[PDB]
Design a protein around this ligand. Structure first.
Ligand code: CL
Ligand code: ZN
Length: 199
């Protein structure tokens, strides 16, 4: 299960952002006594019912696996698109688990190397382009041949996210347009064990 409005993006200065809702890692599973365990308009409607008013959400986090309660004020005042200001998709917790791309070896002077992608510790988790192609990460790379592309990246060392901009270049001198390995599935998901640097 299987049941949440998964965050795929959060707008700058949004109510979502101000309440600490985080892209990829967070699911909105409940708004005011209503459990969002079905693909319907309840979240959208209850956000609207509480416009300019504080309402509490129950939020599930992929990394922590805990539910936390968060307070949000949906609003038409903050300047961006939407009352919440987050891009949301109804996703299973399992699907989200699998939609992560582990950076493997990085070729010394590759576009990936120029972009600062870190071998084995960087994990690609999103892109702020949910326009009309934000499907596969590989699909995304092929369409930005010769074009800068903004990635959301998680790093297992810092245990935090950052925005990476990379220009895929099929003519860079190696094979691929990225010039790094990408790992998927078994042994390539977000680590559950903390990294060696304690803390
Ligand atoms: Cl997902
Ligand atoms: Zn999702």
């Amino acid at each position: 299960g299987g049941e949440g409005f998964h965050l795929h993006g959060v707008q700058e200065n949004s109510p979502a952002q101000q309440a600490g809702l985080e892209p990829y890692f967070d699911f909105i599973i409940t708004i005011g006594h209503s459990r969002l365990n079905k693909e319907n308009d309840t979240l959208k409607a209850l956000l609207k019912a509480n416009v300019e008013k504080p309402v509490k959400l129950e939020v599930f986090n992929m990394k922590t696996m805990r539910v936390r309660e968060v307070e949000v004020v949906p609003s038409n005042m903050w300047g961006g698109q939407g009352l919440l200001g987050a891009s949301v998709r109804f996703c299973s917790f399992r699907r989200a688990s699998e939609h992560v791309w582990h950076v493997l070896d990085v070729e010394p002077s590759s576009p990936a190397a120029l972009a600062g992608l870190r071998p084995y510790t960087d994990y690609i988790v999103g892109s702020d382009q949910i326009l009309q192609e934000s499907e596969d990460f590989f699909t995304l790379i092929e369409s930005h041949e010769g074009k800068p592309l903004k990635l959301m990246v998680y790093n297992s060392e810092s245990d935090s996210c950052r925005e990476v901009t990379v220009t895929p270049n099929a003519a860079w001198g190696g094979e691929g347009s990225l010039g790094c390995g990408i790992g998927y599935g078994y042994l390539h998901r977000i680590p559950t064990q903390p990294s060696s640097q304690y803390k």
